[PDB]
Scaffold this motif. Structure first.
Motif, short mmCIF file in Angstrom:
data_model
loop_
_atom_site.label_atom_id
_atom_site.label_comp_id
_atom_site.label_asym_id
_atom_site.label_seq_id
_atom_site.Cartn_x
_atom_site.Cartn_y
_atom_site.Cartn_z
N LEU A 134 0.84 -1.19 -0.10
CA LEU A 134 -0.07 0.11 0.08
C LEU A 134 0.85 1.33 0.10
CD1 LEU A 134 -2.95 0.79 0.37
CD2 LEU A 134 -2.50 1.10 2.55
N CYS A 136 0.62 4.23 -3.10
CA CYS A 136 0.73 5.65 -2.81
C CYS A 136 1.68 6.51 -3.43
CB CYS A 136 0.66 5.60 -1.18
SG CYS A 136 -0.43 4.70 -0.21
N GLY A 152 -0.35 14.88 -1.29
CA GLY A 152 -1.27 16.10 -1.13
C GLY A 152 -0.44 17.26 -0.08
N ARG A 189 -1.76 18.72 1.87
CA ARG A 189 -2.51 18.56 3.21
C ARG A 189 -1.38 18.31 4.21
NH1 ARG A 189 -7.58 16.82 1.58
NH2 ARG A 189 -8.57 18.61 0.45
N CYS A 222 -4.51 4.29 5.78
CA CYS A 222 -2.99 4.35 5.73
C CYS A 222 -2.63 4.80 4.27
CB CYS A 222 -2.56 2.84 5.87
SG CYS A 222 -2.48 2.53 7.73
N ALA A 223 -3.42 4.87 3.25
CA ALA A 223 -3.39 5.64 2.07
C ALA A 223 -3.32 7.00 2.18
CB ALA A 223 -4.16 4.96 0.79
N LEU A 235 -2.59 9.01 4.54
CA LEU A 235 -1.29 9.46 5.17
C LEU A 235 -0.17 9.51 4.37
CD1 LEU A 235 -2.08 7.40 8.49
CD2 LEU A 235 -2.48 9.86 8.23
N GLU A 236 0.25 8.23 3.60
CA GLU A 236 1.48 7.89 2.87
C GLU A 236 1.42 9.22 1.62
OE1 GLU A 236 4.20 6.27 3.14
OE2 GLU A 236 3.40 5.19 4.95
N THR A 237 0.15 9.18 1.08
CA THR A 237 -0.28 10.33 0.09
C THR A 237 -0.77 11.31 1.36
OG1 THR A 237 -2.41 10.07 -0.39
CG2 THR A 237 -0.90 8.86 -1.61
N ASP A 238 -0.33 12.61 1.27
CA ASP A 238 -0.73 13.43 2.23
C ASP A 238 -2.25 14.21 1.80
OD1 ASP A 238 -0.04 13.25 5.05
OD2 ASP A 238 1.09 15.37 5.18
N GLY A 239 -3.21 13.17 1.57
CA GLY A 239 -4.44 13.45 0.98
C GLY A 239 -4.57 13.94 -0.58
#
Ligand code: ZN
Ligand code: ZN
Lengths: 340, 170, 126, 550
Positions: free
Chosen positions: B153, B157, B163, B165, D300-301, D303-307
């Motif tokens: 995962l 990602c 992002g 964010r 968990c996705a 977070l690893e991408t920050d949105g």
């Protein structure tokens, strides 16, 4: 309509001689011709197979073919079995030609090339011959694996699978002969009786009597055959288990009174010895006490319309052999006591 | 010869419904609920969860693997695996309404610490009860999931432009 | 407590709609100084009935295994021969219950075996 | 073009040594081993066909030494012969390996040996003696009942294994799980074979009673793959009880969702609603377990991408379809939303479940403005008897498509006096975890830009540099997404769109971001049915033209 007779019967001849080892004359032309005729039949089966007088006419030609050949004399050729066998005639043909060792080498290459191009026609709108043949081997290897990794003989032969299926092959194969009305099921079942292994056969028939109806004219025919021919029915009651004959009876009351008749007739060729406290037969084959207890055990352990019948058939054969109320005289007193 | 009665055979009857009910495929969990409302409606309006929560942890003997190895299993691992998975569902469904004393004894088992072949699911729902109580932050990498998941995962990602964010606060 | 609760609706799909809609409209007119009922009466713009039927309020006239009416045309039909249980069931649910239990014993096309709720003799004829 | 024989001639010796191990796999472990490695065997064979296809027979000795014995072992082994097209392939192999005119007797001997092998596959009586005799006499050849036969065998087990279920603690024939085990090894080779579905079905529903699992996950993973490639199509009950008893299949369906949204089908949210609904996931998700585990891989996705906006869009689709499969099957007996999302106020969810189709376009401001006010209390008054933290209250807001996105397009429609509630809400969306100092600054930067933009909308159709001035930092995505909203909303747009797009699309990242933005905006509109056909055709054109640029 008549256009299809001349096609199909000449194809039938070609198919019949296919597995016969005179294959020297054959070439790619013969193979191409065979397979295009078979595609045509497969298209016939598809198009105007359902709800035709053509349908019934073809079956008449088929079943008349299978009775004029017999399963007797010149050769017991299978042939394509029936109405559904038009749909996969091709494959029957294909399978048989490969077994045939006399197949010349050029024909075998062109054949196999025509059966399995490759994935060059992976895009094929009709399921071609290639895909059916894969499917076969698959189900086929599939059936291996179940059989040797999770198949068991159910004891209640009724709730087995092989038997349960072989029955259905028999029922379909008499449903056709009934419609035909050329030969009576009797003649067929007489010839069967000679030909195939009896223990196997009977269990089939036994279970056949039970399968709820599929068009029970089938079951109704077998009881007439059995009650007609006494000698086989003597072996039946002798060969099976008890619960099987119990359910035979409660379904078909035409079997109650003659079955009971056979037990009556076995009990009356025993004799007691005092020194071992047991009923035993004179002759070696004479169904022992063990076996006879059990079957009456069962017959009683049955629905109400048979229990009364059989229990009364005991009290009557008891009184005929002296109304003793003590063991060591009347086989039948013995039994009636042994049921508490 | 090989009759065994179910592990909950000896228990007080309403348990025997609860867990009789939760035996039955994935809608087990409603049926568990169904039972709770159907015993607020029968004369023991209460159901003594502290009875059932002891009974679960208490161990009994089993001989499995070879013909010969003696072990002590608790109820929870001994009873039907679908009854596990739904129980655990139902307990997220009435967590507030149980005493802590029992829950913690359950979970510790659930954790399946120091087993070969732990049961993923149980461990997870263990985690998901710890994380609802507020006592199993655990300061670990203690999320319901498999490592083999976690990584596959992160791996995907990573094939995307993060992002703007802000969700981690170092 | 006074805060808005999660609330949702059982009954006629035709009757459920407008209430479910007016809730959606009036939800921002929740207030935690008035009671739950004094918010609900003015949110859904209704009154409730004060025990509309207090005796036959409702008997869960449901399977007592699956807790549903209408399992595949079967109704809660099959019952207990007991004054204290009277719990309906379905043929299918009760067959798959009692056949699993060790206590129950099977005649020809009948099962005699314990009612799930009260453990009294109950008979099922398929 | 580099190797030719080397990797293949190595994997040959690997496989040939391994086929001699397995050899008809009439044991448990020969079978597990066969069971797993089979797939790679299949690819080996595709490479092997290409190698045999290009060249001709009897002539070359490349691996012609032992190919006979490789394909023997392969063939006589039935665990192989059940896998997808392995049998057709091995045929394609042999078709190359025959000769039309064999000249030395070795070639003829091979050809004979191949007719032998083909007959062994196709038309061989390695089944029960009595049934052969019976049928041959009856006048059938194996072909014409093999089928019904099979189906029967199955429906015996199918039904029989169903009975094993019903006897939940009865003094009866407990069908010994070693047979169960057996089959489950038999179903993996042939999950793809239509005439077994029922069997499968009745293994994956009738777990019964054992402390322990009794199947092997070679089976749970086989099932998974043919489901999500849609090469078995089971009943829904089957697959929920599958997830529910081998948790790494459920994780592993969720990955198989992620790769759809990440790799192949970036921003085709009709195909993603298609994939969610034709997965049974919303369904499985009625079950408080399965959804809790789903949400955590979703977490968990996040977070690893920050949105990632594209990951957020797929959550809005999941909730969407969850709610309305939850709704459906849940009149009596459903699990209370403090059970599904337990980390936040039941109140707030109960608001946010209320869908905007079934609200007036005019009462959306009311609704939003109230949501924000309670959020303000749940995050800022983080007291005892509230959330753990803000994160969880934001995670609530994400799941709800409609609400999160509608703030901006309603700020433009209330640009004259912007409501502080919506300013705070929106800065919360585009940045949670700020400090109230930062949120005040974000709100008022936005308020300045609302002044500038309202002046520019009430003016004529003007340049793009005037807009890129106000654009010119940590609040960039806030401002860009609001400004795109401006372009699509105002009738002054559809004219100087391209001028702004080309400036803002520095990178590919920004372009992909805005593609996702547009697809989301349009799926949102078409769903709620709400349109200015200007903005529809404009967005479609720009989406079409930008997906070439990237
Ligand atoms: Zn029911
Ligand atoms: Zn009762």
């Amino acid at each position: 309509m008549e256009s299809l007779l001349q096609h199909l019967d000449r194809f039938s001849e070609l198919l019949a001689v296919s597995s016969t080892t005179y294959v020297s004359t054959w070439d790619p032309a013969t193979v191409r011709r065979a397979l295009q005729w078979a595609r045509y039949l497969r298209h016939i089966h598809r198009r105007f197979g359902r709800h035709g007088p053509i349908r019934t006419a073809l079956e008449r030609r088929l079943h008349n073919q299978w009775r004029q050949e017999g399963g007797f004399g010149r050769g017991p050729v299978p042939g394509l079995a029936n109405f559904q066998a038009l749909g996969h005639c091709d494959v029957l043909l294909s399978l048989r030609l490969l077994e045939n060792r006399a197949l010349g080498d050029a024909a075998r290459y062109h054949l196999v090339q025509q059966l399995f191009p490759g994935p060059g026609v992976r895009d094929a709108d009709e399921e071609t011959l290639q895909e059916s043949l894969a499917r076969l081997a698959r189900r086929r290897s599939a059936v291996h694996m179940l059989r040797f990794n999770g198949y068991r003989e159910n004891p209640n032969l009724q709730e087995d699978s092989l038997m349960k299926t072989q029955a259905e092959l028999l029922l379909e194969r008499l449903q056709e002969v009934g419609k035909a009305e050329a030969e009576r099921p009797a003649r067929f079942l007489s010839s069967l009786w000679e030909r195939l292994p009896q223990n196997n056969f009977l269990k089939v028939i036994a279970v056949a009597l039970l399968q709820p109806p599929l068009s029970g004219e089938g079951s109704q025919v077998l009881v007439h055959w059995l009650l007609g021919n006494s000698e086989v029915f003597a072996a039946f009651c002798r060969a099976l288990p008890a619960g099987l004959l119990t359910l035979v009876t409660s379904r078909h009351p035409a079997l109650s009174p003659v079955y009971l008749g056979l037990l009556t007739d076995w009990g009356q060729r025993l004799h007691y010895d005092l020194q071992k406290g047991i009923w035993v037969g004179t002759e070696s084959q004479d169904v022992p006490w063990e076996e006879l207890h059990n079957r009456f055990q069962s017959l009683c352990q049955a629905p109400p319309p048979l229990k009364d019948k059989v229990l009364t058939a005991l009290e009557t054969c008891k009184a005929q052999d002296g109304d003793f109320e003590v063991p060591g005289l009347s086989i039948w007193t013995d039994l009636l006591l042994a049921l508490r | 010869e090989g009759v065994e009665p179910a592990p909950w055979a000896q228990l007080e009857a309403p348990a025997r419904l609860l867990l009789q009910a939760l035996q039955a495929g994935p809608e087990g969990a409603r049926r568990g609920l169904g039972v709770l409302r159907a015993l607020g409606s029968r004369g023991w309006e209460p159901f003594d969860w502290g009875r059932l929560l002891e009974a679960l942890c208490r161990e009994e003997p089993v001989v499995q693997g070879p013909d010969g190895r003696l072990e002590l299993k608790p109820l929870l691992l001994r009873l039907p695996r679908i009854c596990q998975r739904n129980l655990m569902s139902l307990l997220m469904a009435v967590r507030p309404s149980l005493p802590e004393s029992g829950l913690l004894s359950v979970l510790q088992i659930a954790q399946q610490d120091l087993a070969p072949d732990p049961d993923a699911w149980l461990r997870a729902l263990g985690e998901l009860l710890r994380r609802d109580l507020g006592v199993g932050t655990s300061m670990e990498g203690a999320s319901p999931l498999s490592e083999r998941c976690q990584r596959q995962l992160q791996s995907l990602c990573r094939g995307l432009g993060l992002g703007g964010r802000r969700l981690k606060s170092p | 407590p006074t805060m808005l609760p999660e609330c949702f609706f059982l009954g006629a799909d035709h009757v459920v709609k407008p209430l479910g809609i007016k809730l959606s409209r009036n939800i921002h007119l929740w207030d935690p100084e008035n009671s739950v009922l004094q918010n609900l009466k003015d949110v859904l713009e209704i009154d409730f009935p004060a025990r509309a039927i207090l005796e036959k309020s409702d008997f869960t006239m449901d399977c007592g295994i699956c807790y549903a009416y209408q399992l595949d045309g079967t109704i809660p039909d099959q019952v207990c021969d007991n004054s204290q249980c009277g719990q309906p069931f379905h043929q299918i649910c009760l067959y798959e219950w009692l056949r699993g239990l060790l206590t129950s014993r099977q005649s020809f096309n009948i099962i005699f075996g314990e009612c799930p709720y009260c453990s009294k003799p109950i008979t099922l004829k398929m | 073009m580099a190797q030719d024989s080397v990797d293949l001639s190595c994997d040959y010796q690997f496989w040939m040594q391994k086929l001699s191990v397995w050899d008809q796999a009439s044991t448990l472990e020969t079978q597990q081993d066969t069971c797993l490695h089979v797939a790679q065997f299949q690819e080996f064979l595709r490479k092997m066909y290409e190698a045999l296809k290009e060249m001709d027979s009897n002539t070359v000795i490349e691996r012609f030494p032992t190919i006979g014995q490789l394909l023997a072992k392969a063939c006589w082994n039935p665990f192989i012969l059940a896998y997808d097209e392995s049998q057709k392939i091995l045929i394609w192999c042999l078709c190359c390996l025959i000769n039309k005119e064999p000249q030395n007797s070795g070639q003829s001997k091979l050809n004979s040996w191949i007719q032998g092998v083909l007959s062994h596959i196709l038309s061989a009586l390695r089944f029960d003696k009595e049934v052969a005799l019976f049928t041959q006499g009856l006048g059938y050849a194996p072909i014409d009942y093999y089928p019904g036969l099979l189906k029967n065998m199955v429906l015996s087990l199918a039904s029989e294994l169903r009975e094993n279920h019903l006897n939940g603690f009865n003094t009866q024939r407990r069908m010994a799980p070693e047979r169960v085990a057996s089959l489950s090894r038999v179903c993996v080779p042939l999950i793809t074979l239509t005439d077994v579905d029922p069997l499968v079905e009745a293994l994956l529903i009738c777990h019964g009673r054992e402390p322990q699992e009794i199947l092997q996950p070679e089976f749970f993973e086989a099932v998974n793959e043919a489901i999500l490639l849609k090469k078995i199509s089971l009943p829904m009950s089957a697959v929920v009880c599958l997830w529910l008893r081998h948790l790494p299949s459920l994780e592993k369906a969720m990955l198989h969702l992620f790769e759809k949204l990440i790799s192949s089908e970036r921003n085709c949210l009709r195909r993603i609603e298609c994939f969610i609904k034709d997965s049974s996931l919303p369904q499985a998700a009625c079950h408080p377990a399965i959804f809790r585990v789903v949400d955590e891989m979703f977490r968990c996705a996040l977070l690893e991408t920050d949105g990632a906006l594209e990951i957020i869009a797929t959550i809005q689709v999941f909730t969407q379809c969850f709610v309305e499969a939850l709704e459906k099957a849940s009149k009596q007996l459903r699990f209370a939303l403090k059970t599904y999302f337990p980390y936040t106020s039941p109140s707030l969810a109960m608001v946010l479940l209320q869908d905007p189709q079934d609200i007036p376009r005019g009462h959306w401001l009311q609704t939003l403005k109230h949501i924000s006010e309670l959020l303000r209390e749940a995050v800022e008054d983080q007291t005892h008897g509230s959330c753990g933290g803000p994160f969880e209250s934001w995670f609530l807001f994400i799941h709800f498509g409609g609400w999160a996105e509608m703030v901006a397009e309603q700020l433009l429609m209330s640009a004259a006096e912007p409501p502080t509630a919506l300013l705070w809400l929106l800065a919360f969306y585009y940045g949670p975890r700020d400090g109230r100092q930062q949120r005040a600054q974000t709100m008022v930067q936005v308020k300045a830009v609302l002044g500038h933009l309202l002046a520019m909308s009430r003016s004529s159709s003007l340049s793009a540099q005037d807009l890129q001035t106000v654009a010119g930092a940590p609040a960039q995505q806030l401002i860009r997404h609001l400004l795109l909203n401006f372009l699509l909303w105002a009738p002054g747009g559809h004219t100087i769109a391209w001028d702004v797009i080309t400036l803002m699309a520095h990178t590919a990242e920004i372009t992909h971001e805005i593609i996702g933005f547009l697809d989301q905006t349009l799926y949102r509109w078409n769903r709620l049915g709400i349109e200015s056909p200007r903005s529809e055709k404009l967005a479609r054109e720009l989406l079409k033209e930008l997906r070439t640029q990237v």
